[PDB]
Enzyme design. Structure first.
Site, PDB file in Angstrom:
ATOM      1  N   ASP A 155       8.991  -6.905  -0.106  1.00 23.43           N
ATOM      2  CA  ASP A 155       7.689  -7.481  -0.394  1.00 23.43           C
ATOM      3  C   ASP A 155       7.328  -7.292  -1.863  1.00 23.43           C
ATOM      4  O   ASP A 155       6.194  -6.996  -2.234  1.00 23.43           O
ATOM      5  CB  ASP A 155       6.640  -6.956   0.582  1.00 23.43           C
ATOM      6  N   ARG A 159       1.195  -8.442  -6.762  1.00 19.72           N
ATOM      7  CA  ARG A 159       0.158  -7.728  -6.017  1.00 19.72           C
ATOM      8  C   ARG A 159       0.605  -6.327  -5.582  1.00 19.72           C
ATOM      9  O   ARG A 159      -0.259  -5.487  -5.222  1.00 19.72           O
ATOM     10  CB  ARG A 159      -0.285  -8.612  -4.846  1.00 19.72           C
ATOM     11  N   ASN A 160       1.929  -6.111  -5.509  1.00 18.60           N
ATOM     12  CA  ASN A 160       2.519  -4.862  -5.046  1.00 18.60           C
ATOM     13  C   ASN A 160       3.116  -4.013  -6.156  1.00 18.60           C
ATOM     14  O   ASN A 160       3.952  -3.140  -5.896  1.00 18.60           O
ATOM     15  CB  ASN A 160       3.520  -5.106  -3.932  1.00 18.60           C
ATOM     16  N   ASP A 173       3.392  -0.216  -2.136  1.00 21.41           N
ATOM     17  CA  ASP A 173       3.295  -0.926  -0.879  1.00 21.41           C
ATOM     18  C   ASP A 173       4.646  -0.999  -0.180  1.00 21.41           C
ATOM     19  O   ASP A 173       5.172  -2.076   0.053  1.00 21.41           O
ATOM     20  CB  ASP A 173       2.478  -2.203  -1.046  1.00 21.41           C
TER      21      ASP A 173
HETATM   22  N1  LIG Z   1      -1.744   4.329  -5.555  1.00 16.76           N
HETATM   23  C1  LIG Z   1      -2.845   3.613  -5.797  1.00 16.76           C
HETATM   24  N2  LIG Z   1      -3.599   3.706  -6.954  1.00 16.76           N
HETATM   25  C2  LIG Z   1      -4.555   2.719  -6.771  1.00 16.76           C
HETATM   26  C3  LIG Z   1      -4.610   1.883  -5.561  1.00 16.76           C
HETATM   27  S1  LIG Z   1      -3.334   2.443  -4.539  1.00 16.76           S
HETATM   28  C4  LIG Z   1      -5.673   0.971  -5.121  1.00 16.76           C
HETATM   29  C5  LIG Z   1      -5.494   0.244  -3.841  1.00 16.76           C
HETATM   30  C6  LIG Z   1      -4.251   0.027  -3.204  1.00 16.76           C
HETATM   31  C7  LIG Z   1      -4.179  -0.620  -1.966  1.00 16.76           C
HETATM   32  C8  LIG Z   1      -5.348  -1.034  -1.343  1.00 16.76           C
HETATM   33  F1  LIG Z   1      -5.286  -1.645  -0.157  1.00 16.76           F
HETATM   34  C9  LIG Z   1      -6.574  -0.795  -1.946  1.00 16.76           C
HETATM   35  C10 LIG Z   1      -6.652  -0.140  -3.184  1.00 16.76           C
HETATM   36  C11 LIG Z   1      -6.405   0.355  -6.290  1.00 16.76           C
HETATM   37  C12 LIG Z   1      -6.336   1.287  -7.507  1.00 16.76           C
HETATM   38  O1  LIG Z   1      -7.140   1.042  -8.431  1.00 16.76           O
HETATM   39  N3  LIG Z   1      -5.473   2.345  -7.663  1.00 16.76           N
END
Ligand SMILES: Nc1nc2c(s1)[C@H](c1ccc(F)cc1)CC(=O)N2
Ligand SMILES: [Co+2]
Length: 288
Positions: A155, A159-160, A173
């Site tokens: 995936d 977006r990921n 993700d």
């Molecule tokens: N490891 C991460 N660091 C962040 C992540 S996940 C965040 C995010 C990821 C998946 C989701 F569904 C909702 C929010 C957004 C962000 O600003 N930083």
């Protein structure tokens, strides 16, 4: 399977080497929700080695969670345990699995996903060409590492990929990722997907290369939506007839060659991630 339908406790096997005690985690502001969980900022003590709190991201079940969401979150955690540390991957840092709600602690990326990062910086300090190539190189290095760990992401998309405060790109993700029947690969977004994934129900590192190609197009369009104007129902017919997306204006010819090689119909004719790293390293060095 773990299940929410218990009247005693959580039924997750202990895994001491990943467990963080709950007093060493303080939950903070919500970051957003995904398909099977929500993410909140938090501070964690002693998990990266001095009692200084480190900001982390905590994935947990949503208020409208399902039993499958539990299974999914546990499975994601178990995949991430199997992926070693790499600067261009969002890595697992710990978990709270006993004696309370399930919390999966992962590296925090302050600037969010690459797709929105790029779109927010469309011209109307700008993003330069060099910044774009740097983004592509970093993702390639992450994917090269994943492939070496015998992991197919399945995936990959802008977006990921997440962006840190210091603009480090980290692939995220891992919910669909697999350690290398009729509905195999039915959960993969078709506009990022190597044709063989659906037509042959196989998935190799070379399939991830196809997706990387699509991601490269996303980077150089500053977060453009692939195959604009073409519905997913029309896509594979167009691809079989040999249509490929056009060169982005920000892409040079040499980069467009790399992108088109990733969309070889024949998986074995696409470059490997090791070869992509080499190619993009070359581009990045000449541009400086
Ligand atoms: N490891 C991460 N660091 C962040 C992540 S996940 C965040 C995010 C990821 C998946 C989701 F569904 C909702 C929010 C957004 C962000 O600003 N930083
Ligand atoms: Co070729």
């Amino acid at each position: 399977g773990p299940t929410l339908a218990n009247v005693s406790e959580l039924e997750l096997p202990a895994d001491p080497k990943w467990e963080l005690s709950r007093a060493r985690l303080t939950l903070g502001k919500p970051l957003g929700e995904g398909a099977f969980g929500q993410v909140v900022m938090a501070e964690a003590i002693g998990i990266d080695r001095a009692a200084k709190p480190v900001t982390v991201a905590v994935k947990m079940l949503k208020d409208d969670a399902t039993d499958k969401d539990l299974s999914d979150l546990v499975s994601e955690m178990e995949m991430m345990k199997m992926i070693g540390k790499h600067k261009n991957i969002i890595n697992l840092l710990g978990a709270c699995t006993q004696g309370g709600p399930l919390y999966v602690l992962v590296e925090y990326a302050a600037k969010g996903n690459l797709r929105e990062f790029l779109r927010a910086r469309r011209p109307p300090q700008q993003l330069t060409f060099k910044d774009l190539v740097s983004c592509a190189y970093q993702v390639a290095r992450g994917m090269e590492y994943l492939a070496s760990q015998k992991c197919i992401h399945r995936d990959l998309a802008a977006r990921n990929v997440l962006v840190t405060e210091d603009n480090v790109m980290k692939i995220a993700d891992f919910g669909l990722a697999r350690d290398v029947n009729t509905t195999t690969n039915g959960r993969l977004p078709v506009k990022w997907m190597a044709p063989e994934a659906l037509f042959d129900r196989v998935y190799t590192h070379q399939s991830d290369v196809w997706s990387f190609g699509v991601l490269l197009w996303e980077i150089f369009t500053l977060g453009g939506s692939p195959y604009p104007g073409i519905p997913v129902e029309e896509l594979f017919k167009l691809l079989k007839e040999g249509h490929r997306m056009d060169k982005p204006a920000n892409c040079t010819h040499d980069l467009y060659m790399i992108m088109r090689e990733c969309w070889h119909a024949a998986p074995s004719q696409r470059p490997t991630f090791k070869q992509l790293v080499e190619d993009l390293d070359r581009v990045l060095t000449v541009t400086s």
